[PDB]
Enzyme design. Structure first.
Site, PDB file in Angstrom:
ATOM      1  CB  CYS A 134      37.000 169.944 -72.823  1.00  0.00           C
ATOM      2  SG  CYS A 134      38.099 168.754 -73.647  1.00  0.00           S
ATOM      3  CD  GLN A 161      43.140 166.793 -76.050  1.00  0.00           C
ATOM      4  OE1 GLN A 161      43.653 167.494 -76.926  1.00  0.00           O
ATOM      5  NE2 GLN A 161      41.854 166.433 -76.072  1.00  0.00           N
ATOM      6  NE  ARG A 267      41.466 160.753 -76.005  1.00  0.00           N
ATOM      7  CZ  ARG A 267      40.649 161.805 -76.008  1.00  0.00           C
ATOM      8  NH1 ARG A 267      40.653 162.664 -74.997  1.00  0.00           N
ATOM      9  NH2 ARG A 267      39.838 162.006 -77.037  1.00  0.00           N
ATOM     10  CG  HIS A 274      41.978 167.526 -71.639  1.00  0.00           C
ATOM     11  ND1 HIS A 274      41.880 166.172 -71.401  1.00  0.00           N
ATOM     12  CD2 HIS A 274      41.088 167.800 -72.621  1.00  0.00           C
ATOM     13  CE1 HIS A 274      40.970 165.650 -72.204  1.00  0.00           C
ATOM     14  NE2 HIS A 274      40.475 166.617 -72.955  1.00  0.00           N
TER      15      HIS A 274
END
Ligand code: NDP
Ligand code: NDP
Lengths: 369, 369
Positions: A134, A161, A267, A274
């Protein structure tokens, strides 16, 4: 064309089903739905009566399909794909999982960037197409104009992300953590005269307590961040960071002289978009205006956001991008290191271009051929 | 030494007061508390009786002090400082505000990095010491070992900044937004059978509604991010981004041949810790071992974390660092671009080393000389 849908019920599968209905893809195919737990139950009706849910592990039934779009998962592919190809199945396998992504027989599909590669593969017997990581897809959807022209010497990517990237339960956990944090200081917050340091102490203690819901991330996400995604590799990179380099270069077909891509994947507490902060070393000192032109004209979804405060805050964020196919790129400017150093910040929905959309598009390309 | 305290009641000032109590700084000075809102009443008692609250704007009163430590803000410094200096005051002005930072008569103070410069300044007539931008201080506290040896050619910094950098009200707004987000889907959040897409849909709508609490940030922070901090400058930089380079090079005394430092500063949903993902270009190919030693042995607060998944998740995050003086740095490794390219990720509490700590330490240094 009989197309089997595996993993249609999960998170990525639901976004795919939703997109296929919106684009009316079912009108072009004969859908057959599979399941690994609800065999026999009536199949969902997305416009056509597909009958009952078939057995997702029945190689013999899968063999009667012309193509299969699976959002089931890696372990599924590992178990079923080999046995299916070995059974002589020569149909098209469209996968969301990373399992076959680096197989010589497979093509990573991101047509706005590599349509030609995909077509040449279809015209020459390639039957396996896999969506890329992704993060890689969103990066190339934003900077395709530059890579396409071989203008990138190297690129450092520091990511932000979304929770959804790790899974649906991870997204739920993020929002739960948000509620637990607020619950702990809701009274103080309602009191305009409360001490911010008191509120801070309470929020930190809550996040650090055993009761804080961290089953899925292992540690807090809301109010924090985690500078490590996926397993560790021998050179110190995390698998997430390693994927960027190998996948982008396969997509671009630059295996013989790959572009060095590296950085740290982090993260953060975003729902499903994202974002990436990129340091792009250009091979030439191209005027910024032309750079913006190259970027904007590469595809229909990328969007160059003017480097102005107000507009950047309103358009270059997950709040803005979530649920859309738009891929904005902003903060485009030359950096202090030199005019061949380009800064870029981009945001993209990782469930659409980062997952479901390429699968959708790949079916339409095969059908069109 | 008679020391006046201004802004001791606010967020930064409160952290400073608690640190001064912990370190017993008050036993070495004669504190005089000033107020910009009410005078004549008793001053706070942080151990010793300090008398009454004085008028923070009265020039004559300030002229009776040997030093002033102020966390009141720039508006205050702009009103008082010039007049005080014009009045002939030659006492020490220790400021948390950015006002005088680039003033030729001011030294940016971060003694673990530039004690020598500070001492030289004291011995030569410098009477104004200003704490640097929180992001600058935190970056240098982590990488001082490299910069001290002149091994950095350039550095690209992509930040993840906490709400507190913007103020107490911004932190409160962040937590309130978290509550609003959770409230919107609280009922179905815990039901695994409910649609994660429907949950996502509601969260997205809630964040976009006009009533979402965004008076301070202007847009959502919780569940998103904002890739722009402070006003725009003529080149593409935001003032926050511009500060990094000019302030770092002033601290290091390299204004005649500065190290190019640039990147994008992003606000994320953290409470009081700033994190940074750095792409460090080294002038030489130094063994990672030496780099680790260099970084780790520079000061008593930096903490180099093993480059491993689990330890990184528990140690290199705001959740771990918040409210402490520790400055962890991890993910240290050479990048795909070459052995002279070093990746690093660091986290630091922006209210301590990023704000209050340099102020009390500067006081102790002046007391000693
Ligand atoms: N998350 C992201 O942003 C991205 C994910 N991917 C990849 O896509 C693949 C699928 O991911 P994802 O969709 O998150 O996986 P999910 O867990 O959401 O769904 C996968 C399967 O789990 C089963 N399942 C079990 N319980 C439930 C439930 N309560 N509701 C719905 N389904 C359930 C379903 O199969 P059945 O009906 O047979 O029970 C479903 O098809 C993975 O390989 C992942 O790596 C790729 C790019 C991005
Ligand atoms: N926040 C951060 O992370 C960083 C902040 N800084 C700088 O520090 C300076 C001060 O910031 P900050 O401490 O956030 O400012 P605050 O708003 O928290 O406090 C400043 C002053 O506001 C007055 N005040 C009014 N109402 C209240 C109240 N309810 N509680 C406490 N004080 C109140 C007090 O002055 P009085 O008692 O006279 O009425 C107080 O000294 C700024 O220049 C900022 O740029 C620098 C680095 C980091």
């Amino acid at each position: 064309m009989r197309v089997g849908l595996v993993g249609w019920r999960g998170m990525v599968g639901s976004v795919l089903m939703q997109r296929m209905v919106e684009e009316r893809d079912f009108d072009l195919i004969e859908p057959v739905f599979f399941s690994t737990s609800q065999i026999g139950v009536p199949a969902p009706n997305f416009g056509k009566d597909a009958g009952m849910l078939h057995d997702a592990f029945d190689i013999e039934s899968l063999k009667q399909l012309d193509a299969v779009i699976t959002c089931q998962g890696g372990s599924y592919t590992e178990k079923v794909y080999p046995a299916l190809r070995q059974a002589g199945w020569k149909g098209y396998w469209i996968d969301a999982a990373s399992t076959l992504r680096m197989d010589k027989e497979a093509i990573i599909t991101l047509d706005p960037v590599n349509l030609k590669q995909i077509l040449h593969g279809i015209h020459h017997g390639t039957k396996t197409f896999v969506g890329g990581n992704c993060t890689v897809s969103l990066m190339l959807m934003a900077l395709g104009g530059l890579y396409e022209r071989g203008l990138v010497e190297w690129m450092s990517a520091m990511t932000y992300q979304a929770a959804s990237g790790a899974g649906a339960q991870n997204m739920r956990e993020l929002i739960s953590q948000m509620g637990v944090i607020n619950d702990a200081v809701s009274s103080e917050l309602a009191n305009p005269a409360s001490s911010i340091l008191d509120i801070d102490k309470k929020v930190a203690e809550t996040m650090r307590s055993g009761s804080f819901p961290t089953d899925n991330f292992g540690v807090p996400l809301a109010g924090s961040l985690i500078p490590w995604i996926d397993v560790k590799r021998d050179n110190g990179q995390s698998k997430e960071e390693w994927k960027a380099g190998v996948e982008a270069n396969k997509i671009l077909g630059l295996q013989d002289s790959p572009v060095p891509i590296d950085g740290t994947c982090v993260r953060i507490g975003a729902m499903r978009c994202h974002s990436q902060a990129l340091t792009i070393k250009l091979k030439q000192n191209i005027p910024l205006d032309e750079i913006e032109e190259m970027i904007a004209t590469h595809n229909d979804w990328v969007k160059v956001i003017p480097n102005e405060r107000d507009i950047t805050a309103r358009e270059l964020t997950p709040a803005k991008v979530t649920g859309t196919l738009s891929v904005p790129v902003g903060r485009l400017r030359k950096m202090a290191m030199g005019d061949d150093f380009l800064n870029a910040f981009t945001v993209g929905d990782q469930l659409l271009w980062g997952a479901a959309e390429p699968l959708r598009r790949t079916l339409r390309i095969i059908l069109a051929e």
